[model samples]
Target: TIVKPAGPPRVGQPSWNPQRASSMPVNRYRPFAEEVEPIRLRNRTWPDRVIDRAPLWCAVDLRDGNQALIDPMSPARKRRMFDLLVRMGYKEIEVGFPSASQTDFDFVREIIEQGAIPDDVTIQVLTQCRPELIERTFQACSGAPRAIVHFYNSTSILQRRVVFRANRAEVQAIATDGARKCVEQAAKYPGTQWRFEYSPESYTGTELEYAKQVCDAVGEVIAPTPERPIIFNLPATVEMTTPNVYADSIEWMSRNLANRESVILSLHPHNDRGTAVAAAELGFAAGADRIEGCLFGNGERTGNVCLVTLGLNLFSRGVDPQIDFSNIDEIRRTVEYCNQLPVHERHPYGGDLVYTAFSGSHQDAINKGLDAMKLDADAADCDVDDMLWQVPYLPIDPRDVGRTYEAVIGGVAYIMKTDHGLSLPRRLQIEFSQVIQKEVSPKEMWDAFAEEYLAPVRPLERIRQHVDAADDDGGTTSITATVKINGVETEISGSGNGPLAAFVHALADVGFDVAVLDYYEHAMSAGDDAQAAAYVEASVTISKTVWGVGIAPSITTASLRAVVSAVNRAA
Candidate 1:
């Protein structure tokens, strides 16, 4: 029963199948356009701006990330994370939401009391825009040489009414009063260098004008100057709309924020709709000076935008990410150990298998591309380092972040990070994914594909001790061989002018209909026992024709195994 499409095909049906899941109740949901209005910036200029520089980075792993964890890191784990962040060259780090948890409070106090703070780095602590929380947050942050006191109040219309049951003026008062309280608390710890950060939490959900009013009101209370600007962290607490809309909002805020010179615009994007990275990138182009996120994007909801990925994106744009990840694997392992969760194998730059590949066409192009680089270097009259990285499929150098050179393939490509085997044949393509579906090394794959497709040499054994004798007239070459017939060892003999011809005749005598079509052998390597590979083709009754491969130190012995393989496959 062929069910034809009831009418004409869809307008653009070739790229997609004519079939659709019409049973789905898709009409129940409203599109993002209906649910959230996009920002209307008529003269948007971010599209033409190029990011030729790196953004200032602030790690919030210890604070925002800890809350998202089902098992929050211990003080010991937190110390390790803080130390790791220090090594990564993060100048500004949010140490904790000290006002929320006793453990966080203790960790902040311990770091300051222990003089763990480096002279160059500043620790930050977060609190809700409440008087009590502000007092407690400052308590935890006391004695640090330099620290940022970040406070926030939800300014979104939904949170204002539904969560807090507050009017616009009340939210503004809470935010401004929190700023004054933060300044008052800072006076008690005059020895500590103080910086202020404020967030209108869920900035994406708030009206653009209302969000600005609150930010300006807090900035007025802080009395920020260009020499020491207040940090305004605009968070996509919930990624409610598309990336461009977020971009529109950021550009608009960048233009409208009061005393723009006295502010550091930062982004804290959550990955609820999985566009956090794109949104953050556009935010920077829209005039953000800094980015705040967890190390590998761990935070509430779907985690924050991965700072490592953002930095790597900068690397692709030819800008130094400023943070060194020369040994990225170590960083990821440490993160996994402290978080008690694995960084997903495909999660951007920090993921274990993101920069690896194993396939026929891919491996071939990789081989050819690398080979071409040397030729380009020789002809271009430049050293390898001076040569441009133009390898096919490898846009970014994996070695830049300590990954394998072989680049991306499909279906979550993974590199096992092995010293790979070399000079592989492209024709063995079918064996790659067919046998080794898991992430594999090139050496491991070679062994796997060889065993899988290279016809098993069984049921026919060629004893190597053989006679290659011939008469002077060349009438016939008596090629005798000691062979095994099933379980018994025996001798099979035949005479012909050609040695291989007599071998085939000898096999025919032993009740085999094998016809030798072709044979060849070549060196597999230049040194180190120098193994050789043999290829043989044969035709027989069971199968019309088949190919076989064999490898050994001796060329003739390699050929012997190959013939056996050929006969076995053909029969």
Candidate 2:
């Protein structure tokens, strides 16, 4: 059934009967399009400031980090890691959380009993807020020759009122009780030297005045004397805010403190919101002295702050953190395996590609920067090569951490024809993250390749041409062959099997031949029209002779150039 408009009766509505009738206004239809809402982005701005400060890097890898691991580190692995740290020059290392497990206690005792601890480095033990746990921590350090018993507890209002159902005074009593237990236990080890440290766990979230009262009580009871310094490790347990706030808190705490010299301000930060390192740095910048965290930040939540990265950052910035983590690759792998966790690829300083560049633009910049360094070397009239640059890509040299130059700049996809292979001398000199093979034209490449493959038949043409004239004795048989270096030229001639032999003999004939044991030639850039870069290595009697380099498109010209460079250097 079909219905017609009431205002106008239509005859061809459904039956296709064409007919026009009564007057009716024309009706028009308009198409409607759907509209989409625009997306809004956060317009927050971050401050740009350089953080420069040295950290008293303390590795809690075996303690805090080890506890969170599914497959915990074995006694052997822990011992190995402990020894590695001592070898790396770390002055202080937190061994384990003795109160949590017997394995940790046993390990700490072994290190102490076996004399595994170095004279310069002190071993530390970790414990929680409970008095019984603090007693267990003290017992673990009892027989140790020298050690620090680190005690900590959650002091945030939520942890106090909600978690423990305690008021400010009661929470303060719990902390005082734990410190008293540690202080009491220290009495048993009369022959050994020991120190106390307390972390007002979640210190940043706690009320400032109340937290200071708690720290002050421990100071008066355990570390009252200036001779016996105490470490107050204030940790930003749950980085809920910016780093500057934490810094301001530390500065306030350090300034108003009654006993100044007897306290060493320490920080232990966690990466719940990923600002652990920043928090640690700012804490130090504000007044903290020591830093305690895990290797690669392996902890409960997101993880503890990474001590390796923190320390290396200081080393690179020219401050000595007193810890030798110069070889971080091996350290990173060991920590990852023991913790049963993998280090993130972007992990600073220790990850696989922290200093790597992949974009084509970055690769091009690196290529040009390296070329400029090489040019500067040639221009300086010195054999030393320069790799430091103000290029767009790299920040700090990868070599500072025992990384090689080739591995730093190895992944760039697109490159030009002028890029050359990593020079042996240059590679030995700098740590590279990547290398680019310059693109070349087919015609030029083919021409250069052919010329190099087919060497100059008369390899000694130049030598033969000047051999007879290279003599200081005024003789016609010896030739006066001259070679120039840095615009200084000298001539010598000799007679031998061929050109190289004759040149060597001629140089000796004149008075500048140190001694040439061997000579070789290589076509560095292949193609008929390509240029061949030559390398000449020789041992001289000066006891300090060096190798030389020369470039030319022609084989004969390159060979002569190499020999000439070598002769001139020795002369």
Candidate 3:
């Protein structure tokens, strides 16, 4: 039985006993340090160390990430994820644990067979230390332009005693024998750019001395060189300690690993305790050369450390993250689509609300900082773009992540697409109406509305467009586009009195007979670099009236795309 506390418990006093339990267990779990022996070091090298460079980032979304998914990605989503990773400048990607599933094995085979793998990019596949699984993993990556075979087996005290029921000697042999098998398999496939990665799973839970022995033993068998260096990935499989402790463990391993030049240490920290990001940064500071993670920190338990957050941390600190996040929203959308999981609205740097300023004081300070940037630029006699960023509270520029200052103005939605026509929700419309009366311009608000709700997720994409206005005739504009229509690419052409009308003419042949009821176009901003947006209110047979939007550097294409979007919506 529990007594109801009156007026809440006093500050620093408890409503319930935390040492034991009220609604949940507390003391049943012991501290990590007490259970796992800390390494003996007189002075820690990592405490004073500062990171000066970016580590080799490896994305394990397809393997380690996929393993954790409740409903793993389809073959198409896998390919899309792979393409996204490659496009964003990840050279090394763990494509799959091919030995684990038929879907993975086929995916591995399909990508390589279709010449989809770029020469500069390397696909990695994972397997356990078992012979058949190892052999199958090699088979999956056959004839690859470049591939890494990552292998691992659990070496933790609990994993050994409970999961495997094996002693230290038996596990060590499994790793060494697996290393030899990997080498033999590599010899069998010569044309492939074959590399090896070995992880002692649950490195944090294992005895440090024993972990070193296993790594050193595998290193001997592999005999890594400078050019052909092997990767020794130490994963936090289950995150259990403070970031400082993980940093300490990484430093200790970095110092003790045999033939440091022949090996690169990779960290795979999880987020069970919600400090995976902190752990990863400190791990790099503590002498790790590489790190591996999923995009948004997704994995088996609480999820892996987020490589996106890790890279952005470097970006904010003036280090080149070597990955592109220029269009973070697009990246976020793609990840969500692939994983079928929503990135939290408060997710660092990439979430929808990360850049939003909900507090009035927060908004006030941010606007003042933004205005001061220009004044500071004037004082220095340089372009505001060239001025160093010093925004208040905002760690990084929203523009760098493909967002705008207008997006920061929270608690307003100028418009939303619904019921065949754009409608402002009544709840938000009142606030939006009042907000719009302030500094938010009508055009600016409209642009913001379209940017968020109607950023042209088009069914028809114009790859190449050409438009001529009255060059050959008195009152004629001719347009032509190589439009990708619902998976087929073909030519579309027409002539009308104006470009918008001409676009309508061209689209007719493609099952679109859109009548543009009203239209308008505006520059997103007043710079040469700024793009333009086109809004089209159209009446279609399938729907009463729908508003469509398109934005691009070219105004001609943009106007036509507006029509395309409307037509697609109506279709």
Candidate 4:
């Protein structure tokens, strides 16, 4: 059992035993790493999987998402989120369930009166078939440029018997009456163009025939012309199964839809049992033209389908669905602040680790994939190099959503992989075969290797350890080197205009036989005071294939050590 790092174990916590499990037979432990190589390789690159796109957006954050909150966002907060949705480029936003609260009623009025409603964006208001609530909903959207009057009544057999206590026909008429009233109320205001959207509240459990009948009744009344279409939002209100079932249901409705061309098929899925994303995706596959959901699935139960995930997923697959989420991170911060609820770190696309790479194997693979891309870029005349490195661990570039690239190879600490050790002679002689390849002079290798391997993983500590350890006092008036190697004292007395060349010459005289092939210096972390690491690269003629490296906090010291390491490797 996995126990918390810093806490008392619960009553029955099992202590860990590393002696190996006795569950398997002795001969059953076959070598399977090679067989599993494909899985490992697959994790190194993205496969560019395709998911179909849908057109319209339905913002259910205000209706379905609002119901789940303990202390939901106030009207002011709701208005802020509403304005954010408009700025985010959603053409249709479901403002709220006005029938449920006075706040909802007032919020809708604020959107209408304060010019919060955009000229291009449509405001959709949801309500039950009760006459008073329906009238209030219409009142909320009356003065807006374009608005949808959405009406629904529960039609599922279980809901009718257990929840609503009504027959199928009664629910059907109530929905029809609501749809009719929508057209009449829309017509009441002459200049504005009013559209209609009707839904069967528990659409998934409602049979195909009855659902079609309900839509047919509403469509006949409101969607008589194709130019001014009505929307039939069939919601997977409580997703209890795989998305295929929901897709098949949508496909059935789409295939036999009476007002097929005249009506827009919309879907609103809730993430109960965690199939909400699948439900929404399959609904589009089955024939949904629009999606109704909240940002990051914030809603009544688990939440609604996450439109941000869906939108980016679509964009990554090469479809211009007309929704712009180029600034999704900003939107996340704003919404999280307004709701006063924490977004789980594991929510897809928006999660903290969505773009992070922690495992060594994963990082190694990413590094190799990147190396391959560099090669492909060099071979300009070669055929299209679809180097799949971009595929691994990421479905799309999170940076496309304005996220930064974070490579936390050493997961527990903020230290980078750039730190190199300065080992003493005795230790180097022992772990020679286990050393990380660095080419420094023999004089520098002993201390450099030890320092890198034994230093703290924290960046600040590592920097101070390297910088302070490469000390000096002995050499000449020119190049002052302050380190002792193999009982010989080497001091960098002064700064030689070419300290590297002078240091290499000094090392050679002291019997440090090495060759300097290449060198590089890099600032691992950011900021002006960030620590800079120097890499001294060299190769021995006999050990022709292997390149040794020497790293130090001071670039000059690292380079001098690299030369000495190369000489040692040669010896």
Candidate 5:
């Protein structure tokens, strides 16, 4: 059924159907502003400050990310990922939640027993606020040389009313008990050096005041002093708000938390809202000191913030992210293998096609940029890589990440390092120049260069067998040649002012009419029998022009081959 409107078209009504509207309900959803108020900071300074340094990066791939995988990584794969993380300069790694699974527990024990954990690298373990779980977690960390005991409890308003069914005070009590229990367990493991970390899960949805209350209660119990610090990891477990609000909340916590200097504020952002990376960067600008994320943002829902993107973002801005992704492709392969998932081909820095350009304009600009870099290198008398990068569309040098560039032309492939400034067309010319000056015979040079570089035009599969040159009466030069056209031996004769013109007249008998537009040549060496390289620009019609090249011991034969080369290419 259709309902008719009484007057002119109403707002949002289609112009063609202004007089009639469908009966389907379309106003059933509400705005997000109805649930959350807008956050405006009158004194916000993060927007004005630049990120000039990198924060401490902690990888949670083995803990938070692995559990979300459809088929979680095996112990062997986990060890492979762990070793890769260590090599990438991650000083701290959330290795596993050992208390929750036997595989995780055994892997942690194996690493410790085998002395695989480096002295400088600290392994982290996660557990809930339950007493038995806390004890089991400590048991897993018993012999680890250095470790962080991370504990968490839900603190969001929704969790309080729906999931936990507890009041704010009860939630606060849960965190304080867990904090004290972790301290007690650390004391029991006297052989291991222990650090503490606490997270108020769903921090983005929790009230700033109540979240601060829980963290302060946990901090008070731990009594973190200057000698020992506690990591207060604030996670955007669901990304419930915009990035600026999270930054505001982080700044508020930094201002209100007790022993601010003794707390290393950390951020763990989920990509639920697709702004986790932005929130983390802003959180850093808002006084956070550390970040915890997965390699390519692989986590529960939309995944965690991608550490690779974040690190490269800093590198693009001229700041060292401290993490080494110089071999980004290798790291990407390992991550893909461990997760059993393919990284998107468009994934920022490590994708298969991120550095490739297909549009003609983009190719032209990149080609010109390479040319400019080569010129700069020549001016400074240094390597091309030493120059500052200024290429269009490309954010960073692909070679920095173990990738190369390949330019294709006429179905032929030529590999060029990043240092090469020649485009595909220029490369073709350069290759031709190199081959034609190598002192090869005219027929040999034509077959070799033409088969590889020229288009598959008309095939005159003929070889020059022999030739005779003489000056006829009236000062005219006449030439007769024995040539094979498509394996058939044929003898042709002609008379003209020059050998090339006489050859053209002979070709006319075989149904080829060509006019030489331009011709060039250079001797390869200063000798009577030295090779000569020749170039010819010719045309069959007014518009069908083509360029060709040849090399031979005699200048006259080189010119004839050059004409044949041009005719074959144009045909």
Candidate 6:
């Protein structure tokens, strides 16, 4: 029999003994640092650097991302995602590898033949460095207004030795020969503005000097200039080393590449080691001009660096991301539909949980910060959108992306869309009863209700209230109020069982007829000094209903104002 360790075992110390099962093979793994040489950058600069501006973004969602999907997108789904990318302000989109599949070929043809390509947007098509593939790629892009013919060949030492069984000279010849073929193919489409991009695929594992030599040869064939630049995409096909090493390699290329000004250095970092994002940012800091990736980083293996994360990362620091992610939820839905892959709930800015605060301490800080912002907006008498954002924990304003804190922090609905007709009595009985029961401040209840339910297009501009609070035990109340309807001011008065009921009768004097469906009131705090909160649900016509809120020192006055508030909304 095996003996058990007494009490709680100490951590970082082995619990197994010779009497028990043998320990896991201790020498099974080796350190990764020994296999690869770190780039020499004694005077490196990315360490103490910041991404001050947004780099040129190239989205490969339709091509690279689609191929990785278990079931690749249909032409319709591909079109939807393409349209979405265009609307989101992406200038360069790698639509597909037309040479690889008929589905891809049809998509490229459809976009070009149908004149779907935007004047400002450039559609990119990928091809391997083979004559037939290069010719097929050009054929697909025949009628495109502007197109990028992207071609690549593997240059890694492992690929050269085992896959191709070729030497450096052979690999270099392949690239140059393909470059010449691309130029020849482009001569067939003189009407289209043809730009070229070449990549030494698996660049991280390739000899840097050899990679540069091949790129220079390709550049010489294309003869790129300042007016029309050639893109040399260096990909960390499989992230093998630390981010700094990748940054150093990028810097070395930036310093050594011939006719560097006429070449656009782009980085495509994969996430095998889960450091693609870090590597891409560091590469940018090390002098990369462009980045190519998927929207939420959906691709093969560990996926590509996320453009959404990178863009918002720039936006958080006051840099214009250029790409519009104002409606991230909709974009997420579209991407998920196209790829049939769910974006992780914790995925960067677009994720479900990225803005959510579950901890009590975090909730308190965000609540206070929002309160501070509201107070500042009120003090300055300015729109909330004009106020500079300073919310704690949230790096970027959720509203900037069409998301609201009310949904995340509070368990309240942001009301994206509501088709159900407003059932006044039902809504008040179900919602306001809780407000009356809770011992919270009247202002808090009003704010909570408005933020939760109301969908005002513009801010409420002005409100005026007057009440006759007399000790009349006639079991009824009278009140007068003024409200603005479409920039017109109107005043009215009436009497009923209570202040709100009376106000409902009063609005008739101004051609605004209303029926009180449900009403509730409660003290905001304890004792005689406590203010009161009132909620009213009423119908404007028999077909439409609305809910409103009010707060004042007297319960009667609070009820009166709520009726006015509802009327204003209902109108």
Using all chains and alpha carbons, the TM-scores for the candidates as numbered come to 0.68, 0.60, 0.68, 0.61, 0.67, 0.67
Q: Over 4 Å off in model 1, which ranges?
A: 1-29, 378-386, 406-571
RMSD of each: 18.1, 24.5, 18.4, 19.5, 20.5, 20.2
- Cα deviation at 525, candidate 4, in Å, is 54
**Alpha carbon lDDT of each predicted model:** 0.80, 0.67, 0.82, 0.66, 0.81, 0.81
- How well is each residue in 1-571 modelled by candidate 4, as lDDT tens digits? 3433443445555667223333335474332222111111112111232445456887777767777788788877787788788887888888877777788888888878888777788888888888788778877776778887788888776788889788878888888888777777776776666878888888876776788998998888886577878789887776645676677677777778896888888998888768888887767766678888888888876888888878877777777656777776788887787777877787777777777888888777766766666677677654323433363666665556788657894111111231332222332333453553534444355365445433222211111111222235653324535445544344433233366655554444444433556566655455665444454545444244123334555555555554544444444
Clashing pairs in 6: none
Candidate 3 accuracy as TM-score? 0.68
User: What are the per-residue Cα lDDT tens digits for candidate 1 across 17-89?
Assistant: 7664344456876665565555668898888888888899999999888888888898889989999999998
- Cα misplacement distance, residue 268 of candidate 1 (Å): 0.7
Q: Judged by lDDT relative to the true structure, which candidate is superior, 2 or 6?
A: 6
Enumerate residue pairs that collide in model 5. Answer: none
Q: Please tell me which predicted candidate would have the highest lDDT against the true structure.
A: 3
Task: Compute the lDDT of residue 409 as modeled in candidate 1.
Answer: 54
Where does model 2 exceed 4 Å of error?
1-53, 377-391, 405-571
TM-score winner, 2 or 6: 6
Candidate 5 residue-wise lDDT, 1-571, digit = tens: 2455444456787767646444456466333344444453458777777899999999999988899999999988899999999999999999888889998898888899989998789999999999999999989887888899999999987799999999999999999999989888888888788889999998877877788889988999998987789999999998876888888888878878989999999999998878999999999899899999999989998999899999999998899999998899899999999999888998899888899887788889988998999999999989999788888888888998888653433212232211221123343466565656655554465466557434333444335634555545556667777665555667776777777888777777766677887777777767788887777777764147666666678898888777777777766
The whole-model C-alpha lDDT of candidate 2 against the native structure comes to: 0.67
Clashes of 5: 0
As a whole number from 0 to 100, the lDDT of residue 446 in candidate 4 is 36
Strongest candidate by TM-score: 3
State the lDDT of candidate 3 residue by residue for 1-571, as single tens digits.
3644334334576657434324444477778866677655557878787777789989999988888888889989999999999999998999888888899899989998998887789888898988888889999998897788898999999899999999999999999999999988888888887888999999989988888999999999888999999999999988978988888888888898889998989999999889999999998888899999999987887898998999999888889999999999899999999898889988998887788777888888987988999999989888887678988878888899897654333334422332123334343355345545656654577775554335554556667778889965567988987887777898999988988888888888887677888777767657887677777778766355666667668787667777776776665
